[PDB]
Design a protein around this ligand. Structure first.
Ligand SMILES: NC(=O)c1ccc[n+]([C@@H]2O[C@H](COP(=O)([O-])OP(=O)(O)OC[C@H]3O[C@@H](n4cnc5c(N)ncnc54)[C@H](O)[C@@H]3O)[C@@H](O)[C@H]2O)c1
Ligand SMILES: NC(=O)c1ccc[n+]([C@@H]2O[C@H](COP(=O)([O-])OP(=O)(O)OC[C@H]3O[C@@H](n4cnc5c(N)ncnc54)[C@H](O)[C@@H]3O)[C@@H](O)[C@H]2O)c1
Ligand SMILES: O=c1ccn([C@@H]2O[C@H](COP(=O)(O)OP(=O)(O)O)[C@@H](O)[C@H]2O)c(=O)[nH]1
Ligand SMILES: O=c1ccn([C@@H]2O[C@H](COP(=O)(O)OP(=O)(O)O)[C@@H](O)[C@H]2O)c(=O)[nH]1
Ligand code: NA
Ligand code: NA
Lengths: 337, 340
């Protein structure tokens, strides 16, 4: 199988550490029905969370994760809710008092975010602000945000918004409220990602659509990335930007060709780079990143920004005419393509 | 397959009528990536809409319908938006000036809406008010709302919210702004519906979970139900509550049996799990003996009286603040009998 062939198989998965971090906690997962969120949920159960609160605005996704976890229904609360609804969210936090928030709600599709930049701003930046602010006010002990390699030297709106989320959450970290962000790259087989698409095209006797002959991504299984996220959250003291070692880059052409050989004839058609799309995402581990006890996990450097400043910029982002230009002022390494 | 066996095969599908209604229109579909919405989008393309504006708050669903329709990318605009965001929504309508809105955005799962009644109120009732109000202020000519047989003498939160939506939209209808609501029953193969549930249970060698041995639902293929919706919309003059003829009801037990038979796997037992809160054994038959006929044998007009919007807007505000949503709904919808 292709997923097998591309799995990382990190040597440093540590079940008992994550169990030690999660046992008997009240954990809330935002975007609980998403690719990342659903797996966060499954692992929270696996590693012994006492109560899992599942927040998602997509009814099918909340339904699906709730139904998937039906054997543990007595430990789970499905909360059908947008994290933009401050008042309802504050109520959820007051009532359940979670000790840990795993924040996996966002918009992530680069093209749809180039087409809908204001919604990417609201959903990603303003949603993260509201959830993070409400977590801190309601004495949540620890807050872990999912980030992405597309947040590093971002060339798209999506990625730049997640970079602003890193800046915000990490700047809210203090002795009482420990925030960590974790960057990682592509997850194998997430819905509406390149692999099931190729599998479909192959099953429909269609040509495989390849963006560019040279395009490469880094890949991990979802269970691999999520367990490493949780190990990172376990060791965090607050303020860390973590980065996962994704292993070898994979050329998407080679991925196409392996999938063809795997089903024993169709042509691969080149369709062109898309706006804001990178030929090679940034390698996540810098040579000056600090090591942790886990070989797959490093801590990248980050400075706090002034929150009065950053809040004003976030206010302005909601009303401004040129979102791209506003984002550059906040994220100077943003080179918008 | 089961789908074929339970397909309505309505004798009165009219392609040329639908084309005449949609040809060269700017049409906006809310919940564009949903089960019903996505089929609405497809048929807008099929029947010659000039420009389809696809509104949905679920990024994957929006992505998927957009991709599904990539051969028509130049005629579609994917708008990643919640209809609760009035100011972004007003600007969408000011920009694209749709002539028709097909409103297929809602929350529909009865158990989730029992557990999240406030979200059901906000997403369904408040989302419908905002979209409808904005459509009317922006001189959209016609507004069609997707409703449900669960809105008829509702016993659940979800169904009751949809009833309120019917009241609001229909009461908004006037000589400039033509509203139609269309009620129909279950769509075969829908998102999170019983048939995929049974398929996944068989795939993992588990027993089939059947709520109750006597439970029945009415069914239709999604393309049938949606083309009939659009035919209703085409003949609407504003104010009509339409109802579809769903044919013969289906006992879910027979469906479960058939699916077991059809994958040869009668090794599997059928465990009875029990009727859920809010859940009906038998949904209401949609056509009343006094409903009016149309030229389509599968579509009738049910009676409705406008309510006063000053009253209805006041109750809608109360729903957002009240202690007891069930009790507040009952004031708006006298026939609401909440099952716990
Ligand atoms: N999928 C990947 O390969 C991948 C890899 C690395 C990083 N990430 C990052 O992880 C994050 C999550 O992405 P994903 O792949 O799980 O996407 P997803 O769309 O599958 O999941 C996101 C979930 O969040 C929910 N959601 C979105 N906005 C919400 C809101 N305002 N309120 C409540 N719920 C909301 C969605 O309904 C969905 O279920 C993104 O920031 C993405 O960049 C994803
Ligand atoms: N599926 C059925 O069998 C069936 C039958 C009759 C009537 N209906 C009715 O049709 C409506 C939709 O049903 P469905 O089966 O399509 O559900 P769905 O969940 O499959 O589709 C709804 C779509 O609307 C979107 N949405 C929800 N809230 C939104 C918001 N605030 N802004 C933007 N988009 C939003 C969702 O993301 C989704 O893509 C419901 O009112 C339901 O009762 C469904
Ligand atoms: O039809 C496709 C879809 C994707 N890709 C490439 O495969 C990689 C993974 O795409 P995906 O959408 O899976 O995730 P993204 O990195 O886009 O978040 C990227 O280099 C894409 O350009 C491709 O070549 N053909
Ligand atoms: O696991 C299930 C799910 C549903 N049903 C029954 O099958 C019918 C279809 O339910 P569905 O959720 O598909 O849609 P609903 O009628 O609930 O909107 C209903 O009478 C349910 O009680 C069932 O027996 N087992
Ligand atoms: Na261990
Ligand atoms: Na539960």
């Amino acid at each position: 199988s292709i997923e097998d062939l591309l799995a990382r198989k990190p040597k440093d998965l540590d079940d008992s550490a994550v169990a030690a971090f999660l046992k008997d906690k009240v954990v809330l997962v935002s975007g609980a029905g998403g690719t990342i969120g659903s797996e966060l949920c499954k692992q929270c159960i696996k590693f012994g969370a006492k109560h899992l609160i599942m927040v998602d605005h997509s009814e099918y996704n909340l339904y699906k994760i709730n139904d998937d976890l039906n054997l543990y229904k007595e430990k789970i609360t499905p909360i059908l809710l947008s994290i933009l609804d401050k008042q309802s969210l504050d109520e959820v936090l007051k009532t359940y008092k979670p000790e840990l928030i795993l924040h996996a709600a966002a918009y992530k599709h680069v093209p749809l975010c180039e087409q809908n930049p204001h919604s990417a701003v609201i959903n990603n930046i303003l949603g993260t602000k509201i959830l993070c602010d409400s977590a801190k006010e309601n004495k949540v002990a620890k807050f872990v945000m999912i980030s992405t390699d597309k947040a590093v030297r971002p060339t798209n709106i999506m990625g730049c918004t997640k970079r602003v989320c890193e800046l915000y959450t990490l700047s809210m970290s203090d002795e009482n409220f420990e925030v960590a962000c974790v960057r990682f790259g592509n997850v194998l087989g997430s819905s509406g990602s390149v692999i099931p698409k190729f599998k479909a095209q192959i099953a429909n006797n269609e040509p495989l659509t390849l963006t560019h002959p040279d395009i490469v991504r880094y890949f991990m299984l979802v269970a691999e990335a999520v367990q490493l996220v949780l190990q990172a959250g376990a060791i965090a003291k607050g303020g860390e930007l973590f980065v996962l070692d994704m292993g070898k880059p994979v050329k998407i052409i080679d991925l196409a060709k392996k999938m063809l050989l795997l089903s024993n004839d169709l042509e691969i058609k080149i369709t062109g780079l898309r706006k804001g799309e990178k030929l090679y995402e940034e390698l996540l581990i810098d040579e000056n990143d600090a090591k942790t006890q886990y070989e797959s996990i490093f801590v990248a450097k980050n400075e706090k920004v002034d929150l009065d400043w950053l809040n004003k910029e976030i206010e302005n982002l909601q009303i401004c005419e040129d979102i791209s230009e506003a984002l550059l002022k906040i994220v100077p390494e943003f080179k918008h393509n």
